Amino acid sequence: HWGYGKHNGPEHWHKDFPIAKGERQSPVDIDTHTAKYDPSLKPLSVSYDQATSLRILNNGHAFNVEFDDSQDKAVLKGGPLDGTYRLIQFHFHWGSLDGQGSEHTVDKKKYAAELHLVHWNTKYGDFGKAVQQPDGLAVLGIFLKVGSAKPGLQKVVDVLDSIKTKGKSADFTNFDPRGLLPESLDYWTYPGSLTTPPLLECVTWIVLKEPISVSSEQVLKFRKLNFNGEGEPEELMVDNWRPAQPLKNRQIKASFK
């Protein structure tokens, strides 16, 4: 029942998830001038060619596209990562207005939305064991701004009508996540946490500098989703983002310049 309302939102989370006030919480504001280029970073490798999407689900907080991670298919490697991280699902965070919606911010700038591609470290066997490790997860974050439509996102947009309410799912096979990436893989990276309860601090965040553009019509359809379940009073699924948290002396590294 945690959520993003005044009575169950981010300001209430710490009561049931004390780690909310931890030393490595996400998201964070990325101060571009303080971020330092890191020559030790290896080339980032996004290998999504064999990705196998399975289903899309409205979980009452956002919608999630799940993938078959039983085998080494869609993986993320390189960059700040040691080993291989398998893609398990992706989801978005968005606002009720174009001027807000992203979780991470850049020089305090809020984007209209933010895409999160969640991966787990294969050395830990499964996602559950991975979230018990300081380097168990890697989330690739991509900012969304409103402008031209993103063709590779339309398939997702058109299926949202079938998963309007919490608990609803639908078959979503053969979706290629590569169509959601921008041209450049320039990124910022830092150690953080899940941005929703349980807020576990097991994530290596990789946030791309170049945002992707989506049309106003596409994001408007994100905003037609419901936080509520079928047969309940409608509460539009908007502003499902957690604000920036204290950096706490962590350092944000840049893969460029």
Ligand X SMILES: COc1cc2c(cc1OS(N)(=O)=O)CC[C@@H]1[C@@H]2CC[C@]2(C)[C@@H](OS(N)(=O)=O)CC[C@@H]12
Q: Which of 199, 241, 207, 180 is nearest to 14 (CA)?
A: 199
91 annotated among ligand-binding-site residues? yes
Q: Which does 58 bind (CB under 5 to 8 A by kind): Cl ion, Zn ion, ligand X, none?
A: none
Q: Which of 193, 212, 102, 97 is nearest to 150 (CA)?
A: 212
Q: Which of 6, 29, 45, 219 is nearest to 115 (CA)?
A: 219
Residue with smallest beta-carbon separation from ligand X:
128
Return the number of other C-beta atoms located less than 10 Å from residue 110's C-beta.
22
Q: For residues 167-199, b (16+ Cβ closer than 10 Å) or e, as one string?
A: ebbeebeebebeebbbeebebbbbbbbbbbbeb
Reply yes or no on whether 61 is catalytic: yes
12 annotated among ligand-binding-site residues? no
- Residues 96-135, interacting with ligand X (CB under 6 A): 116, 118, 126-129, 131
CA distance readout (Å), 154 to 40, 57, 116, 179: 37, 16, 17, 10
66 lines the binding site for ligand X (CB under 6 A): yes
Q: Which does 185 bind (CB under 5 to 8 A by kind): Zn ion, ligand X, Cl ion, none?
A: none
Among 9, 78, 198, 243, binds ligand X (CB under 6 A): 198
Among 24, 77, 86, 116, binds Zn ion (CB under 5 A): 116
104 lines the binding site for Zn ion (CB under 5 A): no
Q: What angle do CA 179, 70, 86 make, to 5 degrees?
A: 50
209 lines the binding site for ligand X (CB under 6 A): no
The secondary element (H helix, E strand) that includes residue 154 is: helix 154-159
The secondary element (H helix, E strand) that includes residue 117 is: strand 113-121
Residue with smallest beta-carbon separation from Zn ion:
116
List the catalytic residue out of 12, 33, 61, 119.
61
116 annotated among ligand-binding-site residues? yes
Among 106, 194, 212, 225, binds ligand X (CB under 6 A): 194
Q: How far apart are CA 142 and CA 3, in angstroms?
A: 22
Q: How far is the CB of 105 from Zn ion (least distance, A)?
A: 14
196 annotated among ligand-binding-site residues? yes
Annotated binding site for substrate: 195-196
Site residues (vs ligand X, CB under 6 A): 57, 59, 64, 66, 88-89, 91, 116, 118, 126-129, 131, 139, 194-196, 198
Site residues (vs Zn ion, CB under 5 A): 116
